[PDB]
Design a protein around this ligand. Structure first.
Ligand SMILES: O=C(O)c1ccc(Br)cc1O
Ligand SMILES: O=C(O)c1ccc(Br)cc1O
Ligand SMILES: O=C(O)c1ccc(Br)cc1O
Ligand SMILES: O=C(O)c1ccc(Br)cc1O
Ligand SMILES: O=C(O)c1ccc(Br)cc1O
Ligand SMILES: O=C(O)c1ccc(Br)cc1O
Lengths: 300, 262
């Protein structure tokens, strides 16, 4: 687009992603701080990676305050530079930094509200994120949180077709993916955000499995093993097994003890087994939990 | 209903309606192309259909590729000996966008019978991405069709398959189809398929959704009706052959209606 690498000053490494390394850089003419994501095509024998083709094409169309902004793509014959707006930290680092303080509830509530705004915008624009986890959520000094890393995102059709199985980092992966369902939809992103909600409150992952089966068993032990009543069709699903242990559903008051009635209500609707009953990001915006929501700066 | 995204299907439809106008090719591009013609484009698209069948690509992939080709050809003058290079790179980009398992680049070189090198395919890939500025998430005929299919009372596989065949037929013939939007060809194809199979018409419910009436679809419908009647005689036959397959309910074997009463 309207860019060149001579006008950028490298500041420091900030990360490494699917394409190599992300740098913090500074536009020497405007002062703007950016993140550069270098996509080496010289080390590419299949030309431009499909990950990059999706990331760029999808991010171009997603203009929203709670989605990271792709400012430009600089095309060289051997190299591709993605220029993003710079954000200071990811939510994972912020949670670790908030270790023994806790994250104050106003900030959890603000962050969840913004994440829902961002995700609703994705889903309204036929985009599934498919890798929502705290490492992929970026925060600034002004109180904003934004969806980032669209490297696994995909443009969907209505109704959805079969897409890539085994998307979503394991701890954030929805039961319908774990059970090998032919179809998944926008409900997978809500499941991830639900796990993230719980994690913002406790500072630890809700379902930290070591395997697909251990992941599922962890979910089952918290929310109860799903049957045909809670989730019609579950017993038919490709990787459903009748030998699965049948754990009783525990009271959600014990799943995240510090959460108030409203919080619990919302969390429960995000973590509903049945993808059809799980709350949408659009509808979640109206949940009573957000009645008193504000947008405070981070505390650190 | 989550597979049909109830909370988002209207937002999505509205958004595709906006995007289809932005992703539209220049209706008269072929007149400004000195060395290629509607006829050569027909040959290319027909080939892409075969390639899609050969590698078991989604239909959506084929439609994306055609979108990429017509938009590139809208701003880039191309010699006839390079038309197939544009097409191959278009199919490669579409595959990486849309497919779980795109074919390797080598396979794309292979299907061109070593007319082009791997280096040429990849160089063209970059060129196409530069000209389109990575605007690859284009609305297709298929993306509208699959939403319209939700309005059937009840769902009918033959109606669905016949609508896809008809929409695919439109990809072949830049004249007249370049002048219609994906959402309008999809509407024509859906009405025509529904009429052929069940005798029914474009439903009220889709008038509500799209704003389109049989009145507004009439011109496109008259084109599509003629394409359907003439399809057995068309120089390009790959789509008819494809839609003989049981995967698509053999719908190319159905007889077009002689008249529409429209
Ligand atoms: O200035 C450069 O040449 C440069 C190169 C690579 C990256 Br990532 C950032 C840069 O700023
Ligand atoms: O992946 C991204 O979109 C991204 C954007 C900005 C920063 Br800072 C880090 C990232 O990883
Ligand atoms: O795949 C596994 O390793 C596995 C282990 C235990 C059970 Br019960 C089901 C499984 O699928
Ligand atoms: O020469 C032709 O008529 C021709 C037609 C289609 C393609 Br693709 C390349 C060609 O060279
Ligand atoms: O030369 C031809 O007629 C021809 C036909 C089809 C294709 Br695809 C490429 C061609 O070059
Ligand atoms: O390819 C381009 O020119 C381009 C320009 C700007 C942005 Br944001 C994304 C792009 O892909």
């Amino acid at each position: 687009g309207p860019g060149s690498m001579e006008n950028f000053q490298k500041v420091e490494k900030i990360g490494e992603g699917t394409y190599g390394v992300v740098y913090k850089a500074r536009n020497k003419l405007t002062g703007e701080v950016v993140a550069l994501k270098k996509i080496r095509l010289d080390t590419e024998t299949e030309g431009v990676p499909s990950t990059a083709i999706r990331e760029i094409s999808l991010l171009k169309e997603l203009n929203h305050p709670n989605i990271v902004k792709l400012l430009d793509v600089i095309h060289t014959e051997n190299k591709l530079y993605l220029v993003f707006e710079f954000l200071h930290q990811d939510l994972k680092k912020f949670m670790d930094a908030s270790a023994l303080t806790g994250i104050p509830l106003p900030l959890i509530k603000s962050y969840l509200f913004q994440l829902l705004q961002g995700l609703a915008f994705c889903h309204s624009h036929r985009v599934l994120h498919r890798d929502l986890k705290p490492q992929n959520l970026l925060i600034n000094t002004e109180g904003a949180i934004k969806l980032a890393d669209f490297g696994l995102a995909r443009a969907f059709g209505v109704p959805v077709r079969t897409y890539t199985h085994e998307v979503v980092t394991l701890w954030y992966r929805a039961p319908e993916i774990l059970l090998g369902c032919k179809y998944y939809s926008t409900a997978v992103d809500i499941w991830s955000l639900g796990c993230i909600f719980a994690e913002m409150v406790t500072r630890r992952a809700l379902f930290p499995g070591d395997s697909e089966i251990d992941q599922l068993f962890r979910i089952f032990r918290t929310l109860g093993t799903p049957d045909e009543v809670v989730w019609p069709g579950v017993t038919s699903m490709p990787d459903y097994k009748p030998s699965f242990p049948k754990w009783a559903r525990q009271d959600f008051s014990k799943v995240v003890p510090p959460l108030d009635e409203d919080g619990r209500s919302l969390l429960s609707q995000m973590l509903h087994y049945d993808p059809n009953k799980r709350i949408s990001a659009k509808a979640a915006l109206a949940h009573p939990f957000f009645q008193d929501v504000t947008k405070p700066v981070p505390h650190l | 209903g989550v597979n049909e995204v109830p909370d988002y299907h209207e937002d999505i439809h509205t958004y595709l309606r906006e995007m289809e106008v932005k992703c539209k090719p220049k209706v008269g591009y072929m007149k400004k192309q000195p060395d290629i013609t509607n006829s050569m484009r027909a040959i290319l698209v027909d080939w892409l259909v075969e390639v899609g069948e050969e590698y078991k690509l989604q239909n959506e992939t084929l439609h994306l590729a055609v979108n990429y080709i017509d938009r590139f050809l809208s701003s880039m003058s191309v010699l006839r000996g390079k038309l197939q290079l544009v097409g191959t790179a278009a199919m490669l980009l579409a595959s990486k966008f849309e497919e779980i398992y795109p074919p390797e680049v080598a396979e794309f070189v292979y299907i061109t019978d070593d007319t082009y090198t791997k280096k040429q395919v990849l160089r063209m890939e970059h060129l196409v991405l530069k000209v389109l500025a990575f605007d690859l998430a284009a609305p297709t005929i298929n993306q509208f069709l699959t939403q319209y299919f939700l309005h059937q009372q009840p769902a009918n596989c033959k109606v669905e398959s016949l609508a896809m065949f008809l929409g695919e037929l439109s990809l072949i013939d830049a004249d007249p189809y370049l002048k219609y939007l994906p959402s309008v060809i999809a509407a024509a194809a859906f009405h025509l398929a529904l009429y052929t199979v069940t005798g029914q018409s474009w439903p009220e419910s889709l008038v509500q959704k799209t704003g389109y009436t049989l009145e507004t679809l009439k011109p496109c419908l008259l084109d599509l009706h003629q394409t359907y009647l003439r399809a057995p005689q068309h120089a390009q036959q790959s789509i008819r052959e494809k839609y003989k397959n049981s995967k698509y309910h053999g719908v190319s074997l159905l007889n077009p209606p002689e008249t529409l009463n429209v």
